[PDB]
Amino acid sequence: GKVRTKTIKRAARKIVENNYESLKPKDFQNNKAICSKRNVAIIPSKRLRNKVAGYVTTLMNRVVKGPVISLRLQEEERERRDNYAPKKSEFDVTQQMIDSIGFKCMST
Amino acid sequence: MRAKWAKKRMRKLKRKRRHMKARSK
RNA sequence: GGGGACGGGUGAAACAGGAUGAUCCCGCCGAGACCGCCGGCCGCGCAGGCGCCUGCCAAGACCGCCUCUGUCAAUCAAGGGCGAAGGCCGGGGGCUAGAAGGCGAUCAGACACCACCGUAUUCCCGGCCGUAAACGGUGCCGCCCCGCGGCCGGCGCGCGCGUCCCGCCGGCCGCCCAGGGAAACCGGGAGGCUCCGGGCUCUGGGGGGAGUAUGGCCGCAAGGCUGAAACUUGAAGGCAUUGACGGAGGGGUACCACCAGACGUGGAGUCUGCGGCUCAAUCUGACUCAACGCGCGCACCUCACCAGGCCCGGACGCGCGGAGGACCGACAGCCGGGCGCGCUUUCGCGAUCGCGCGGGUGGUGGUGCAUGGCCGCUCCCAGCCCGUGGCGCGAGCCGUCUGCUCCAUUGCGACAACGAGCGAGACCCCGGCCGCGGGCGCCGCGGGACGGCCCGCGGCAGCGGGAGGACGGCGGGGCGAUAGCAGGUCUGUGAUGCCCUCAGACGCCCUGGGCCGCACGCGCGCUACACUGGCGGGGCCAGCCGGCGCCCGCCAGGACGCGCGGAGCCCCCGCCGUGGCCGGGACCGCGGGCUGGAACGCCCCCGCGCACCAGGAAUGUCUUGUAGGCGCCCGCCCCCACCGCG
């Protein structure tokens, strides 16, 4: 019955997206200091902070294991694929359909 | 089937009514 | 023929069948039905309907066609034929099933459902009947009609070629764009229709009365077909929406639910509340959950009730009266718990007023069905809604999920919705561990615990273990959505509508009794029913949070003084020895005391020694420091608790 609620989940997800670098995968205690940081978020009350940091530990372990909150640190690789043009184009290089139009490719 | 049972009661009364008519014919 | 005790039946049963050998097995015969699995978005037929084999006999649609004819057509009163089943009337036949009929269980009844037996019937042949939710609830002929699929038949085109591909025609169907409709839905029409006209027949005109009466016809009948009125009534109906509900299904879920247990009540005395009743008065309110030790302890008071009494606490304003007096008490004697209450009586007062009125003022009087406020309850519920957009003529839907996880609309990955909220969380008090600060009293602020970690299984959400760690996944509580309820309180309230009462008051006092009276039925508790126990000593352990010394007395209590203090259970030794006993303590007979103006309250001692020897049918509460056992505190409190808060 310890199901992290959306309030805990929404805050935790934003914190990993904002500072993936600050967090660490197996350390709730480091995450608690990052989460408690006055600049990172203003969490009223100890329980919400403790839980949000616990959710970041699981989320951080997940977002390090795989791209499971977008990762700009991973977006560059996606952008590189977006600009990627194969040097040798596989497709630049039924039979009588062209003969039918009038211009015959593979004539004969 | 109340409609069916109602027409059976009407048919019974109509049999008795015709028979009584015959006695006084 | 075999082999040996049951068999049938059912939801369980029971009846009928079994040593005259059943059931069961195997062969054999007879009798009559009936066409299994293939068997269908298959087909044929005018519908009703239609399925064994081999024939036999006439058909029928469809297709194909440079075949013939030349409007021969359509729809149809009357008229003719056909028509499931059940029924009928003559003949058969007779297995099965089976209205009636009989039985056997059930139930208050059951005569109904379920079982068992069983006649008409079912089957055939010749007649009759003429009806079905005879439905596709949609007449028939004609045209246009948007795509997409299946299936049946006939034919055609094309090719590798196969029961292929693509058509066409006639059917049988599904899905739908338009359109239509009040919608459900039709869409091969229920479209092309308020922009209404292809043709032709049938029927309808609010609901009953009533398909009845009567008349006709038809039938062997049963009945069919036709078919009213008088009169009654403000609705009947259709299709959808939302709730409430189901002995409907699918998820869940909770000791206010059950498992597995516990500890019980109900049974006995008692104690408190309620009903009934008795009464001068027994003030009442409340009646499943959600009335009933409840509305925080009834000598008086309270206090609303009675049996008697007292007086204004009728203000402030207009007219009128009034200083020798407006107002306003009093000795003695009387009468009367008592009151200059009244009286006989003679003595004052001192403008603080009388008198009517305009109007107050109070009233625990009523009505919580006129109400505020609070509070119970639905609900220990997870639901509740919004902005814009989508959908419908609208009521209303969508977001708000028929997928998964939670303790939870708790999340996640979705989705004509997309964003917001509110509730749950969060929060806050009180713990249990660790710092520091503080100490007239162990009291002031911080940490720690997060499903973080491990091993799994997991889009996920998580979950299932393993831990480490005072502490584990919801320690315990406070707050507790929305929409409501004719829930309860006018007897908490310078809360309050409105009526009643208002000077002999429903104002207010004073007295004594009432609420506690008991033929009764019941709810909450307490103490019992003993040896796991009493009883006599000896130790002695608490929290909420709180003081005592000295002497007198059997205690009870009191006097005196002053600064402070503390349980049971349990443990150790004795006695009883299964006896209503040394279980148990109920009334009553005294006695001694307290609080008290006052017992009608309480206390203690000496008698007494009530039922109950473990509570019927029924039901209640309850999961770790938990139930229960065991005491203490505090509330209302003059005194008092078996009660409640703890």
Side-chain angles (χ1 to χ4, degrees):
Chain A
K2 257 168 170 34
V3 173
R4 266 122 281 126
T5 62
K6 66 130 332 269
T7 324
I8 301 307
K9 289 166 133 276
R10 167 228 62 245
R13 286 174 298 226
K14 226 150 160 277
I15 284 334
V16 202
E17 192 250 3
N18 283 32
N19 34 267
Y20 164 79
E21 33 259 87
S22 246
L23 304 180
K24 262 183 321 261
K26 284 300 141 190
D27 314 68
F28 151 81
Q29 252 99 342
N30 115 271
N31 297 332
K32 214 191 42 98
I34 298 309
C35 288
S36 82
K37 234 87 242 90
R38 153 227 308 250
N39 167 249
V40 166
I42 313 157
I43 328 216
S45 303
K46 247 200 28 113
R47 223 184 321 266
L48 292 108
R49 169 208 74 185
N50 275 121
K51 294 194 242 80
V52 154
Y55 195 58
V56 317
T57 331
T58 10
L59 245 239
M60 219 266 170
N61 188 54
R62 274 184 95 228
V63 299
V64 150
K65 147 148 284 136
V68 318
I69 40 139
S70 82
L71 212 54
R72 2 112 78 243
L73 298 104
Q74 253 263 279
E75 263 339 279
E76 325 144 351
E77 280 74 44
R78 314 228 19 119
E79 254 78 274
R80 188 230 290 119
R81 249 50 220 128
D82 291 351
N83 293 98
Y84 160 69
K87 252 59 65 225
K88 147 81 195 235
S89 163
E90 297 98 329
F91 67 79
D92 283 45
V93 313
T94 274
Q95 190 253 305
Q96 215 241 267
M97 104 118 337
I98 29 244
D99 299 57
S100 106
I101 304 147
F103 60 171
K104 333 170 283 158
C105 163
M106 299 137 8
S107 144
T108 80
Chain B
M1 297 83 114
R2 167 89 272 164
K4 176 188 292 209
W5 310 143
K7 99 182 294 188
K8 283 189 48 112
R9 264 152 52 99
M10 244 345 138
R11 271 143 146 263
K12 241 175 92 114
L13 196 47
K14 277 173 61 100
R15 224 165 16 110
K16 221 203 116 107
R17 280 202 269 199
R18 123 213 359 173
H19 296 345
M20 280 344 124
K21 262 250 260 208
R23 289 201 47 171
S24 25
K25 202 61 64 238

